[PDB]
Design an enzyme around this catalytic site. Sequence first.
Site, PDB file in Angstrom:
ATOM      1  N   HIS A 673     156.175  65.984  81.701  1.00 16.85           N
ATOM      2  CA  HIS A 673     156.460  65.479  83.039  1.00 16.85           C
ATOM      3  C   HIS A 673     155.655  66.246  84.084  1.00 16.85           C
ATOM      4  O   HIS A 673     155.684  65.924  85.270  1.00 16.85           O
ATOM      5  CB  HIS A 673     157.957  65.574  83.334  1.00 16.85           C
ATOM      6  CG  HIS A 673     158.788  64.616  82.536  1.00 16.85           C
ATOM      7  ND1 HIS A 673     158.521  63.265  82.488  1.00 16.85           N
ATOM      8  CD2 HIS A 673     159.874  64.813  81.751  1.00 16.85           C
ATOM      9  CE1 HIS A 673     159.406  62.670  81.707  1.00 16.85           C
ATOM     10  NE2 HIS A 673     160.238  63.588  81.247  1.00 16.85           N
ATOM     11  N   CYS A 705     157.802  64.350  75.046  1.00 14.09           N
ATOM     12  CA  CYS A 705     158.015  62.909  75.020  1.00 14.09           C
ATOM     13  C   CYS A 705     156.703  62.139  74.980  1.00 14.09           C
ATOM     14  O   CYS A 705     155.674  62.676  74.575  1.00 14.09           O
ATOM     15  CB  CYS A 705     158.817  62.501  76.266  1.00 14.09           C
ATOM     16  SG  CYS A 705     159.783  60.963  76.121  1.00 14.09           S
TER      17      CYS A 705
HETATM   18 ZN   LIG Z   1     161.761  61.747  75.232  1.00 16.61          ZN
END
Ligand SMILES: [Zn+2]
EC number: 2.1.1.14
Length: 734
Positions: A673, A705
């Site tokens: 992120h 992710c």
């Molecule tokens: Zn994730």
Amino acid sequence: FTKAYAFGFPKIGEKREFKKALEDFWKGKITEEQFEEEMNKLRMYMVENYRKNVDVIPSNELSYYDFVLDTAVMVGAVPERFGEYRGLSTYFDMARGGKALEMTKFFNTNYHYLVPEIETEEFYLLENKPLEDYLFFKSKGIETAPWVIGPFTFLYLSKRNGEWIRRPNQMEKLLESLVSVYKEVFEKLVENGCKEILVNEPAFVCDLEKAHWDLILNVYRELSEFPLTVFTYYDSVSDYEACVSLPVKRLHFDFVSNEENLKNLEKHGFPEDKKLVAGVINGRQPWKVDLRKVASLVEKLGASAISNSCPLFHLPVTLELENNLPGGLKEKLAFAKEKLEELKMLKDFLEGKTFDLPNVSFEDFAVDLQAVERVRNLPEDSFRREKEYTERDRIQRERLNLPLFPTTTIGSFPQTPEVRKMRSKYRKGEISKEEYEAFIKEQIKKAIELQEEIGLDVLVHGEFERTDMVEFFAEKLNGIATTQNGWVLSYGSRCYRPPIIYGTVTRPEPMTLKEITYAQSLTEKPVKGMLTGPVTIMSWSYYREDIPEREIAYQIALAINEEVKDLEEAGIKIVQIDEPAFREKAPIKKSKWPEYFEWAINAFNLAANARPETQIHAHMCYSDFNEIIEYIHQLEFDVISIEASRSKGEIISAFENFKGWIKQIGVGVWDIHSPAVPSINEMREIVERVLRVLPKELIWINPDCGLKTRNWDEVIPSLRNMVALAKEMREKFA
Ligand SMILES: [Zn+2]
Ligand SMILES: CN1c2c(nc(N)[nH]c2=O)NC[C@@H]1CNc1ccc(C(=O)N[C@@H](CCC(=O)O)C(=O)O)cc1
Ligand SMILES: OC[C@@H](O)[C@@H](O)CO
């Protein structure tokens, strides 16, 4: 006379005017004034829809980003890092950007709010938006009822020192100061003529303690002098008696999402000292309802006021132009604008102004008997892999011949503007599918090669052909439909167009085969199959209510399993099933978790029921596994990847303490992120924490992710350090 209420009508406008305005403003394309004027058209658009259908018109509903953030601004909860609140400029810094507040799910819904950060114990009336919006409509000669987030629920949705303010002792002191400001706000509205105020306390439906209710009675006792109407929705209220005993003249209850509120009113009755507002029109589902039946329910309830069950902003604005949906569907549907119109017909009916209500009685509508029975007759062996994990592990490890601490990626890869543009051209017919798939195979071919050069052990095809992890499959499943304008606000300016499960779900043909098969034929290293879990597909879309949720989930689970089998038959050795809804679709009341996880677990395993030689991976985005580890342990995956960078591995704790844990864990060592590139020494800290108790053979090294929101010049470096770290570790322990 039957007083009709309505709230939560979409603010995005019929053409996402709200979205265009927000983004036009952030781009600097329009002035703050032009932005304001744009917002004002939306205000009039919303108010005219209410005016034509219900008696009470809400105000203070057009939030410029989030209503919980709006509440925070009102009471002065503005973290020191933003300096002096200047207005919209400051507001948008709290909503988006580097210093923005945290974003999280609003209860069990698909809307996201901004978590206020309470740094001081004293609140003050910073800005009275309720009074502003109230006066605005008064200018237009329109009497409105301010829509506001109740004091209890506000604190319940906020954090102090990074922790939820959900315990009575945590709230007490704060509540006294807080209620004071609400008192000022309300006193100012009544001075200007406000005759009614809509207070939202959805938190009343959480698993509360008698202690919470002592606080709540306290709070509303200090606000009894004001014309307040309390609303609760998303589930039945935790303590019926305590709630109806509150010193408020009128109470709203959600009589659609639960049967508990009804049974309680039937058992304890309703005080003749206040008025019942029956929320009997669903606000989270798009189906037409038999108004005759809803009418009899209202009479039974003994209420003289009605409204939607929960906010209408979980539905698309209007169904009017949806003329390309499967045959017969449009006649069964009803969006926000249609629900409003449903309350008007209900109002006219109850008042005896009309003696005619539509039919709406779809039953055998779009049903596949063969497939429905094909699911209901599933044997116990349908939810359990042929062999236990220990055995599947040996078979799998011999088949993959992977080194210690293998590396891999979670899924999606960044999509440069070029691939983003190509999808547009294709979508607009500006290109031939034959040429589009050719463009995909090109991005895939490039990705596979880049992964090998970097040194990854298990590869992914990138997912360049997928925009949404649910939409992609939803569009290839029978019994599911997609709209053309059914946009629903996800958060900020982001909108989602949820699919509509209107009939028995079945998978007529292979959905990912060509992409996976192609990618695998370009290398000898294993390539992951990429699938979305049943619950998640269901959770992001609307679905039939005339049948149990579990059945629909099992139906989708079946379809997904057939895909898993085609992947195995085609030679894919590793298949990943991302089920983010596992924990997100869980009931608001943790007390109802046992029943839910019973069928959620079953749905996952039915879909994940692969041959023992097929390694099943599962990615869970959650930041803590303590409260669900017991349910996760029943999922029949062979590898589970988590996001360990934020906690720097501390999140592994739930696993260490779980006596008997033995399955592989993909340790996310890089926060995707952030644009930064974590150093090898940083990722190493994380991996070392996870190796404190769990055997090193369980560990996989991967990113937190998906990488679709990152840039290729951030990915390559990071992936390289990840591989490097893998090599160093592998030399220290081998
Ligand atoms: Zn994730
Ligand atoms: C249901 N949502 C969801 C989720 N993830 C989880 N875990 N849970 C969810 O409920 N991911 C998708 C969506 C929320 N997130 C998002 C993220 C981006 C956009 C977005 O940018 N939408 C574009 C249109 C994209 C398109 O072309 O389809 C927009 O501008 O509205 C929407 C929703
Ligand atoms: O119980 C519901 C709580 O966990 C949050 O989802 C509310 O937004």
